[PDB]
Nucleic acid binder design. Structure first.
Ligand SMILES: [Mg+2]
Ligand SMILES: [Mg+2]
Ligand SMILES: [Mg+2]
Ligand SMILES: [Mg+2]
Ligand SMILES: [Mg+2]
Ligand SMILES: [Mg+2]
Ligand SMILES: [Mg+2]
Ligand SMILES: [Mg+2]
Lengths: 146, 119, 227
RNA sequence: GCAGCCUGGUGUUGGCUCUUGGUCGCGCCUGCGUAGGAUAGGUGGGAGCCUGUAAACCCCCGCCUCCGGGUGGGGGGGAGGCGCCGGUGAAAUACCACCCUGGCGCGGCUGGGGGCCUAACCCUCGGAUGGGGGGACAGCGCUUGGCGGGCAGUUUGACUG
RNA sequence: GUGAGGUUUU
RNA sequence: GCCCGGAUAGCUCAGUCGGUAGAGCAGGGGAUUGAAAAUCCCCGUGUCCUUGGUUCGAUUCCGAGUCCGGGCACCA
């Protein structure tokens, strides 16, 4: 199955190789998300037809995107939460925190992949895997909901 | 498996059977035997000769593991617990302390009517 | 067992050989450091199943070169034994009537002779020492000819056998430590195909699997099954 | 035979992880109802080799164990271990291993059973390109076998005061 | 702390 | 018909994981119990399916099936 990658999918090799994978995986997880493309003679012609004009766009959209650990979560900041509500009635998810960080502290996030699994009632530390060939994740520390 | 040396032990000394089982400090048994390994049926496995190949076999198949002590806990009383436990107390195995957990049955209402003829 | 002699030249075992014919058959002289009269004891394998009827392994074949091995039978003289000074007889003892059940024999057997052919009555009575290993005389041994003077003359410089029980631990006593491929030219030419001609009717499978020509003083080398 | 039901394979239908399975012997070292000296497998050579390129009463010791005990790394030993026979028996080793009996590393495909995520699919929410739950299961197609008067086509002979 | 396969009236 | 497990004494059964073997009845008299029942005791009944073979043997292991059963076909 001729599928071409655009970014490393944590397995299956490197970008642009002739890799075989299940159509149930590539058809539903890779194609509507915009990460792998079906490779005909056209899309199998495009990667050697553009070796700098799009690899420079991977250098921009990946090498320019791998520096967002600066002012987001590593520095100490009081994370804005809702009023207490001592016991958590509505659990925190990946969605319901970036509008708080958009009102206070002015930080804009996706807000996808702020909870890769188990949107949980409790609070603590968590890592944000932002994924250009995935690098070291930034660490958020939720300390209090008051 | 990992052999164990320190730890506690459990003791069953009821009317029909007297079998020990040496444990860890977490409560995991390491072996069990009986008098049925010879074939002692009914009440032929009490106090003075035939079946310390239950408890001494419980320390003898545990001799390959090499336990240090047997902290005594007696569940089920009577029927000659004394020499069956004291075979293991001072003829090959060390002991640390004698702190026994005697069972204290109340049950509220009656169990099977064997006891009620002598109450 | 892994001592001084095996650590010297263990490289010649070579468990990943490609094709060997002569260089794993003739090399028994100095790879087997022997200071005694050794037997090369050539192995083979007869592929059968020993747990069914109509299946009886038996094989006796001769070799007229001489083998460096004498007759050494325990001769018991009976009626119709002498041939009126036949110039090649009456060498061993002629009697003593051994009934040695007390102190259970002397356990050093090499060759057993039995002339009178009374096996229907002496069956499981003369073969007392050799039950499962079975060097007792048998009707299936093929040592019944026309005259009497054909058993000693063939055990002398002959009468080698292949017969196994439940496995294939088989042997071929032919040569000394220094026998040439001129003696392999009648050993591995006729014995490994004699155990292919002699065959029970229930033979089905590989039928020739583990044929090692290994010695008493040396390593285990392997040839192709036809050489 | 069919409707319908159960069920294997397969498409829709994916990502991981755990231990199990099969032709699986390259390797580990497994045989003590046993009658004598016994970690005694049947047997093949059976007077040579363990041996000073580091022995013996048994002290190294992983290895398994039916608890007796033997086989590999041998760091300090220093000419002594003792078997072919006697001894046991349905069989005589100590030198070279033929595969069964087995705890086990893996070469081929993971076959099955679990735990998590989930975008496919399904259900659901006020105004629904978005939330929640199930989740590769269900349903649906092909194929295979069984149940199946619920249904349909059927047969149930002739002589005979 | 311990004991009964257990009996029938001439 | 391929494969699956077995045929033990009028009755049925204790079996071997190769060196073993039978107990109960219509039966006669029997320590018993103070002459009562029989608790209990001798006791009338093995081609261990027909046959071939490792085997010291076969009262027991394995091969073809004649003896009876379940599944599975196949029957012009
Ligand atoms: Mg289906
Ligand atoms: Mg789930
Ligand atoms: Mg979705
Ligand atoms: Mg979901
Ligand atoms: Mg499905
Ligand atoms: Mg009808
Ligand atoms: Mg019609
Ligand atoms: Mg009375």
């Amino acid at each position: 199955m001729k599928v071409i990658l655009l970014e490393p999918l944590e397995n299956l090799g490197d970008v642009g190789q002739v890799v075989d994978v299940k159509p149930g995986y590539a058809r539903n997880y890779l194609l509507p998300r915009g990460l792998a493309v079906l490779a005909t003679e056209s899309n199998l012609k495009a990667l050697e037809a553009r070796i700098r004009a799009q690899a420079k766009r991977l250098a921009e959209r990946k090498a320019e995107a791998e520096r967002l650990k600066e002012i987001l979560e590593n520095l100490t900041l009081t994370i804005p939460v809702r009023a207490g509500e001592t016991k958590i009635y509505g659990s925190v998810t990946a969605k319901d925190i970036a509008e708080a960080l958009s009102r206070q502290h002015g930080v804009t996030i996706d807000p996808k992949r702020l909870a890769l699994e188990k949107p949980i009632k409790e609070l603590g530390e968590y890592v944000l895997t932002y994924k250009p060939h995935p690098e070291v994740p930034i660490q958020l520390k939720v300390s209090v909901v008051a | 498996k990992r052999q164990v040396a320190s730890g506690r032990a459990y003791i069953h000394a009821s009317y029909n059977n007297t079998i020990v089982t040496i444990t860890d400090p977490d409560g995991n048994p390491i072996t069990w035997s009986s008098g049925g390994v010879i074939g002692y049926k009914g009440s032929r496995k009490g106090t003075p000769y035939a079946a310390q190949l239950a408890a001494l076999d419980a320390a003898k198949k545990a001799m390959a593991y090499g336990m240090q002590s047997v902290d005594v806990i007696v569940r089920g009383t009577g029927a000659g617990r004394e020499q069956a436990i004291r075979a293991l107390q001072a003829s090959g195995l060390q002991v640390k302390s004698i702190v026994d957990d005697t069972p204290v049955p109340h049950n509220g209402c009656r169990p099977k009517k064997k006891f009620r003829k002598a109450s | 067992k892994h001592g001084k002699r095996y650590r010297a030249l263990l490289e010649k075992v070579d468990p990943n050989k490609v094709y060997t014919i002569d260089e794993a058959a003739r090399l028994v002289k100095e790879l087997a450091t022997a200071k005694f009269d050794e037997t090369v004891e050539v192995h083979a394998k007869l592929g059968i199943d020993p747990r069914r009827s109509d299946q009886n392994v038996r094989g006796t074949v001769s070799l007229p070169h001489g083998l460096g091995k004498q007759v050494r039978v325990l001769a018991i003289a009976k009626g119709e034994k002498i041939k009126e000074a036949e110039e090649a007889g009456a060498d061993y003892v002629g009697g003593e009537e051994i009934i040695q059940k007390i102190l259970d024999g002397w356990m050093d057997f090499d060759a057993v002779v039995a002339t009178p052919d009374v096996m229907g009555a002496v069956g499981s009575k003369l073969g007392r020492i050799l039950g499962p290993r079975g060097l007792l005389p048998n009707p299936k041994a093929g040592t019944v000819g026309f005259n009497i003077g054909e058993i000693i003359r063939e055990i002398k410089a002959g009468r080698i056998e292949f017969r196994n029980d439940k496995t294939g631990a088989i042997h071929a006593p032919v040569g000394k430590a220094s026998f040439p491929p001129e003696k392999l030219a009648d050993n591995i030419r006729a014995f490994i195909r004699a155990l292919e001609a002699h065959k029970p009717e229930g033979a089905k499978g590989t039928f020739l699997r583990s044929v090692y020509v290994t010695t008493t003083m040396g390593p285990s080398v392997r040839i192709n099954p036809h050489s």
